[PDB]
Chains A and B, each alone.
With several copies, the nearest count.
Chain A
Amino acid sequence: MGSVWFRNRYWWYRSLYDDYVAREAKLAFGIAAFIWLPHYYWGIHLNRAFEVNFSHRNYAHEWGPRRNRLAHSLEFEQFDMILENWQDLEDEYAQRGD
């Protein structure tokens, strides 16, 4: 990586900035190979959180009205059952005639 790919390493060092920081540039790899892991894993967690949030937004947008309509229909069905019982009672009352 870097100077090793060049067969004139002196030219590689001279033509960029005429400066030598190769020691630090090549000793930084050891630290950089592990300095990133906590950030990477926390970023994975945060990306999963964002994905869950997007899925929840989609599900709400698509199904919230459907759930509300289902609940409304359920309550209407309860009223329908009560109405059928009331009609039976009214028919019995008409037939008897207290």
Chain B
Amino acid sequence: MWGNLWTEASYQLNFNIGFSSLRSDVLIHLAQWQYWWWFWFALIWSFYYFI
């Protein structure tokens, strides 16, 4: 807290599941990649369900 400018970057809660912060460009890129990683499993998941 630098005056009224809140410089705190992490506001994670006790049961946080994601990254501590998403302000960093590196963390934003990692989060986007991780989210889109699971999008490309539709056919595999459906095939395994049928099996």
A-contacting residues of B (Cβ < 8 Å)? 28, 32, 35-36, 38-39, 42-43, 45-47, 49-51
Contacts and interface: CB of A to CB of B under 8 A. Distances in A.
B26 to A, nearest CB: 13
Contacts of A21: 47, 51
Contacts of B51: 21, 24
A53 interface: yes
Contacts of B28: 50, 53
A32 B46 contact: yes
A43 B36 contact: yes
A43 B47 contact: no
A47 B32 contact: yes
B21 to A, nearest CB: 13
Nearest to B39: A39
27 contacts: A21-B47, A23-B50, A24-B47, A24-B51, A25-B47, A27-B50, A28-B46, A29-B43, A29-B46, A31-B46, A31-B50, A32-B43, A32-B45, A32-B46, A35-B42, A35-B45, A35-B46, A36-B39, A36-B42, A39-B39, A40-B39, A43-B35, A43-B36, A43-B39, A46-B35, A47-B32, A50-B32
Contact of B32 (A24, A25, A27, A46): A46
B3 to A, nearest CB: 14
B29 to A, nearest CB: 9
